[PDB]
């Protein structure tokens, strides 16, 4: 059984814990403690292949970026500042791992919210400039949660 080391990165409050817990527990956990950083392991079936996800939910080091095989770069669609930080996380990950091909997925979370300050073309344009997929999510409703993590595993399989 193949193990995939995933790392969830993004500004504080974008929903990294809410996304991780929704994948692990299938429950939306409101206002999870912002400083708690844990790794979770979960056996899943992705594209017919049973595998184990080893997911680090970061809380804001160079070690766990070197160990990570794929990275979820999360921003909230109602927080332009979190979207502008995205290129900082990609650059800092590309620096430690010394590679031009680090499996990565852009995640725009909180899509259940109407007051949207970052639109879809912006995010798609940034993701296309990186050569990485863009997945919309809501940890609250669980929309796109499995898609975001499963798409990252597929990116690791290409690599």
């Amino acid at each position, epitope marked *: 059984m193949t193990e995939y080391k995933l790392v969830v990165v993004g500004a504080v409050g974008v929903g990294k814990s809410a996304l991780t817990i929704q994948l*692990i527990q299938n*429950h939306f956990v409101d206002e999870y403690d912002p400083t*708690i950083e844990d790794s*979770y*392991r*979960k056996q899943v079936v992705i594209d017919g292949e049973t595998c184990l996800l080893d997911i680090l939910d970061t809380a804001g080091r160079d070690q766990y970026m070197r160990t990570g095989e794929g990275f979820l770069c999360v921003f909230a669609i109602n927080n332009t500042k979190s979207f502008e930080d995205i290129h900082h996380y990609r650059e800092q990950i590309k620096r430690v791992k010394d590679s031009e091909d680090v499996p990565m997925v852009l995640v725009g979370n909180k899509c259940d919210l109407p007051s949207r300050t970052v639109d879809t073309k912006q995010a798609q344009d940034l993701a296309r400039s990186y050569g990485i997929p863009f997945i919309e999510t809501s940890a609250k409703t669980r929309q796109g949660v499995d898609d975001a993590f499963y798409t990252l595993v597929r990116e690791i399989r290409k690599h």
Partner: nanobody
Amino acid sequence: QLVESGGGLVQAGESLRLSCAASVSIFSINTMGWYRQAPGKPRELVARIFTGGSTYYVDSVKGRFTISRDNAKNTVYLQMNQLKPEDTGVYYCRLGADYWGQGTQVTVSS
């Protein structure tokens, strides 16, 4: 102030109940976890309980361990059944973000 107990030296297949008792009320604390560090390995999250009552267990202990909280007693528990040698390590309770127990030794012999 956390009082930790329940560890000890046991044989494989036996059971222990680890306990983590706080001097203060724990009702407002939303999540609790148990961690362990085995010899030669980094610290890992063994179990966590979340608001709403759902529980997570690392794959190596799923089906044998049970994490619970007793709010009226300000105590958090880890029931460990069918203990295996690989379960040997120092176990730490974590109440919320920064209330850590100072550890309890679990040693499982064959």
